[PDB]
């Protein structure tokens, strides 16, 4: 068993001090994720040699998909433009996505809310996608929340969550 390096869920750009942050699935609020049926926790293994897994949930079959998370503005760089993302994957054998879009919302501390509907049939199969939750410019304080939800009658299958992140625009 290996010695440990401990981390924090933020990063900073060496060139200017700009900060990002992310949350892994055990830090997200996923409804019914421990019910033994709707979701099943997998060991998600990236890489080909010296492989270790991360614990990540896979959607196994439910009509109720509800994924939520939150972030502190104060951990970001004031005045910087950010993109909010959910790193997730539609897997081989997915079901129920033909007529059920995911409803995505990003809620900002000023009370504003960005909404969009995501058609998961347009995602590639078995590769992770950076799903866009929204865009904002950071301020000094406040709570950022997001939700990715569908509770329609269609039984949904085959969707993995890796992390949610607030990243500075790539440049």
């Amino acid at each position: 068993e290996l010695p440990k390096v401990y981390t924090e869920n933020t990063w900073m750009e060496e060139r200017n001090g700009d900060r990002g942050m992310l949350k892994y699935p055990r830090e997200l609020d996923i409804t019914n994720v421990d019910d033994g049926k709707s979701w099943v926790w997998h060991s998600l293994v990236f890489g080909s040699i010296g492989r270790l897994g991360m614990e990540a949930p896979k959607l196994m079959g439910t009509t109720h998909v509800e994924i939520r998370g939150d972030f502190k503005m104060s951990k970001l760089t004031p005045g910087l433009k950010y993109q909010a993302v959910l790193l997730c994957m539609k897997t081989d054998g997915n079901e129920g996505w033909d007529s059920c879009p995911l409803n995505v919302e990003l809620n900002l501390p000023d009370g504003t809310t960005q909404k969009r509907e995501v058609d998961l049939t347009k995602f590639p199969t078995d590769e992770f996608v950076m799903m866009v939750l929204g865009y904002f410019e950071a301020v000094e304080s406040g709570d950022i929340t997001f939700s990715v939800v569908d509770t329609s009658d269609c039984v949904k299958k085959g969707f993995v969550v890796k992390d949610a992140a607030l990243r500075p625009l790539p440049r």
């Binding site: 010695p3 390096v5 401990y6 981390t7 933020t10 060496e14 055990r26 897994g53 590769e127 790539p170």
Partner: protein, 171 residues
């Protein structure tokens, strides 16, 4: 929490489809990486999640720091500008780095090189740090090669490599 899920270490931008790559350090070429007096391999932990699924090397005391990654330019999205990153961390005990900046280098198939320098003595310890190795256009064939190097005549320790990233700069 036992079923394993093997996945490609990559992502696609949602709106425009561009591909990004992550390379964990077990897939890099680490000179002396099999010698525990040079590099000692650790498991990366985030307390609130558990293991992040990455074996990361920590520099233990060697004069020769040399790490290489490589990727097929033709495996990426044609015509986009790409950025190569190294995600790193420094930790106590740090030693040997005074006035010997870590050299980051990208070399292209046409033989041209871009080198950046990072003064490790100025970084905050324990923070995950995004450093930019360079930029390239995704045209033609061949391999882009991306490295971190410090081979001055002084014993160095305290550097941790989390991964390398090749990310597109999309519209």
């Amino acid at each position: 929490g036992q079923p394993e899920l093997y996945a490609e270490n990559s992502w696609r931008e949602e709106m425009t489809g561009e591909k990004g790559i992550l390379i964990y350090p077990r897939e890099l070429e680490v000179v002396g990486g099999d010698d525990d007096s040079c590099w000692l391999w650790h498991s990366l932990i985030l307390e609130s999640q558990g293991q992040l699924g990455v074996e990361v090397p920590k520099l233990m005391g060697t004069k020769h720091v040399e790490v290489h990654g490589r990727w097929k330019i033709s495996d990426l999205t044609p015509g986009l500008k790409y950025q190569v990153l190294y995600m790193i961390m420094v930790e106590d005990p740090l030693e040997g780095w005074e006035n010997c900046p870590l050299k980051l280098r990208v070399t292209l198939p046409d033989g041209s090189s871009q080198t950046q320098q990072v003064d490790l003595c100025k970084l905050p310890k324990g923070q995950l740090i995004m450093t930019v190795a360079g930029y390239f256009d995704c045209v033609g064939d061949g391999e882009v090669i991306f490295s971190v190097i410090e081979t001055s005549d002084v014993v160095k320790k305290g550097l941790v490599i989390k991964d390398a990233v090749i990310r597109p700069l999309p519209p």
